Design a protein around this ligand. Sequence first.
Ligand code: M8Y
Ligand code: CL
Ligand code: CL
Ligand code: CL
Lengths: 99, 99
Amino acid sequence: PQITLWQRPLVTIKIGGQLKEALLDTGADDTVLEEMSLPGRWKPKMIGGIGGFIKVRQYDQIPIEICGHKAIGTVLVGPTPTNVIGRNLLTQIGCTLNF
Amino acid sequence: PQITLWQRPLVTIKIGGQLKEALLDTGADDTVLEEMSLPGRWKPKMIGGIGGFIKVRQYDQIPIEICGHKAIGTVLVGPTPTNVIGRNLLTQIGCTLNF
Ligand SMILES: COC(=O)N[C@H](C(=O)NN(CCC[C@@]1(O)Cc2ccc(cc2)C/C=C\CNC(=O)[C@H](C(C)C)NC1=O)Cc1ccc(Br)cc1)C(C)(C)C
Ligand SMILES: [Cl-]
Ligand SMILES: [Cl-]
Ligand SMILES: [Cl-]
């Protein structure tokens, strides 16, 4: 699609058998979701943004579907104020900024 | 231009006659810059990011060039980890997301 930026670019994602809303963020290195369960190994990470850092669990090789498009990558889970889809997954669905 | 996301979408901006680097961030409502001097009066704003809240100085109607594209709008100045260009100015330069 072509997604306007008059409003927040929120889309539906499918992950771990759940449907969720998340924000497409070209400025984010990583994808970070509010608390949820995911299968497999994880390790702890600290990630920084405006306001400082939060501790999250890093899960690798997680399948996800974003706006209909399948990808696989690293998903971080923790006390983020909002679900964010970062560049690690945006690249996989062919997302570009255009102007 | 068309900017892919395999690296951070860092571009050159010009503000107050000076060049700076800033990140194009579709996840950001607002544009937040690192400490700098701007003209006129400012108003308070509290903005929230992944790590919590910060206090910034809001300046309105500031001219800013982004990748050579002229904009004039609201710039927040405060203790941000990086210069971020948010949707308030991305809409002025005709940016969309495409995949
Ligand atoms: C409506 O309120 C907002 O618009 N607030 C914006 C904001 O914070 N938007 N949030 C998206 C992520 C922003 C950002 O891309 C910004 C950023 C980019 C690069 C770097 C730091 C910060 C560089 C350093 C480290 C890399 N670090 C990230 O790459 C991190 C990732 C690990 C999530 N990236 C980010 O944190 C969503 C959000 C929304 C509501 C609330 Br309450 C909290 C979060 C703000 C404060 C920038 C205007
Ligand atoms: Cl990844
Ligand atoms: Cl590509
Ligand atoms: Cl503005």
